[PDB]
Amino acid sequence: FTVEKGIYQTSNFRVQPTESIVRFPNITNLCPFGEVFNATRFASVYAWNRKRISNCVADYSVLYNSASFSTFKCYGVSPTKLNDLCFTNVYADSFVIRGDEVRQIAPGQTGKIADYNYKLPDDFTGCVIAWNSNNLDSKGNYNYLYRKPFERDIYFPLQSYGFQPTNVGYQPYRVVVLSFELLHAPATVCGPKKSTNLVKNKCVNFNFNGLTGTGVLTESNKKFLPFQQFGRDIADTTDAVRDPQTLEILDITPCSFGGVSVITPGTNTSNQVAVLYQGVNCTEVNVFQTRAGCLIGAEHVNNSYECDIPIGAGICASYQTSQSIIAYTMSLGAENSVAYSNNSIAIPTNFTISVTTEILPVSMTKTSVDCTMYICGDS
């Protein structure tokens, strides 16, 4: 409740974004999910087909909210977030397997199915969608048989499935596996998120093909090769971006930030304070601009005094005359030219005996910490 005289680092200044920018390719094509999930015939597990999905807008909301799917498991991504983020391409693997083996089609699984005819990688990013097909597939039907992740293996190791409607566990299931990739590359499949007009030279919340971030977008002179979509810095963050709609490159500079230091004398003297915004210009915030930042609440004074509260770059602050906080360039000492010449000497005619005090720490409190009792006391 009482603060001593000095300068204290308290908070952090950060320019907040004014508006959010969403930019996606303006393709009106719809991804052909109907011909995948509602296909008349599905391939077998040994020869599961790999449908190629690209250059279209994929609406996963209908897929997620459709009640016809027995299970809807997404492993690398959230099913709700599918519409917002987007991918370079999507791969749908369609096949029919034994009902109890729906567990086996998951990352990090082993079994007769997970090892022989269909294996998912441990770094799988995508969604698996399965539903029973008793009223389409069951007859009996003997067209289904079985025999490195994503392999197609086209006394024999091949034994067929006999599916009949009078069979829950043994009942057939139709499953579609959606595979996603997240390499930084020109995206072609993006969800139904409407793009917006872009604004420059303003702290905004941009979103380029699912690449979220906050910063100031300005015109850039950096040449981006035609295959280059993003530019990244040393810290893996995106430095420059190429607009998906118009082929232009925009610099990404983070919004202005800096520490906030409050300059005060003691509350026992006064309650006035001065605020220093470290390393910012006096535009993003009785305003004094220093090399240490922007100083607010302190009056600039031409006179130079001994430093009282250090601010930086030769600037100090003090509470002086009515009284107020003043900012000044600190004085190094009184000027004194020695009366030097080649035949003059100054010799003291007197002296004084001075006793000065020097104070030195010698020891510190001998604290011993019971390690076990501190971490796991009486447990």
Binding site: I345, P348, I353, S354, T356, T357, L360, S379
Partner: protein, 196 residues
């Protein structure tokens, strides 16, 4: 505010201890920061996970505290070595080292004990009232050059004397205050005066 050097050490130690204590109230991701609450609530299989999170957090806190303590102890040991050297060279003797025992020409020092520290009262000699004088490196007497044995040649305007460096005590320039080396043609700035 004179004892700030000691008060800072005391404050730093107390504040490090306070931070170490406050670190015991953090969850570190567990359901609770209370070990007894975790134990009385969950079966051993899940208590193991919660307790492991707490253990990692508290062990990290202890390691941070001990590392800071070691660094601060090294700093304190450097200060204590300086204090011991000052005692030996400045209380047990007279030090010719400049500013090692206060400002001025060191005479003697007195030790005073302070809580977790030591205070030295440095007694020094400080010249007070200087006067301008005309001076010369040497003096010509009979074609000889006379240099001061100890001190300098000064002139009060008309007469030349020899005085010690740090106190104006003018004396008649005689053959016992000076020594002879060479002749008058070498020294730059020699002056003419009689050597008694």
């Amino acid at each position: 505010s004179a004892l700030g050097k000691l008060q800072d050490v005391v404050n730093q130690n107390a504040q490090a201890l306070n931070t170490l204590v406050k670190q015991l109230s953090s969850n570190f991701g567990a359901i609770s920061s209370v070990l007894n609450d975790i134990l009385s609530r969950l079966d051993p299989p899940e208590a193991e996970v919660q307790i492991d999170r707490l253990i990692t957090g508290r062990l990290q806190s202890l390691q941070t505290y001990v590392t800071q303590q070691l660094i601060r102890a090294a700093e304190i040991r450097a200060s204590a070595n300086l204090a011991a050297t000052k005692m030996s060279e400045c209380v047990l003797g007279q030090s010719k080292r400049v500013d090692f025992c206060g400002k001025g020409y060191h005479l003697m020092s007195f030790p005073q004990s302070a809580p977790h520290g030591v205070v030295f009262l440095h007694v020094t000699y400080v010249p007070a009232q200087e006067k301008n004088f005309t001076t010369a490196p040497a003096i010509c007497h009979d074609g000889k050059a006379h240099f001061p044995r100890e001190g300098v040649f000064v002139s009060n305007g008309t007469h030349w004397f020899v005085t010690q460096r740090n106190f104006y005590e003018p004396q008649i320039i005689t053959t016992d205050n000076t020594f002879v080396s060479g002749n008058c043609d070498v020294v730059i700035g020699i002056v003419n005066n009689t050597v008694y």
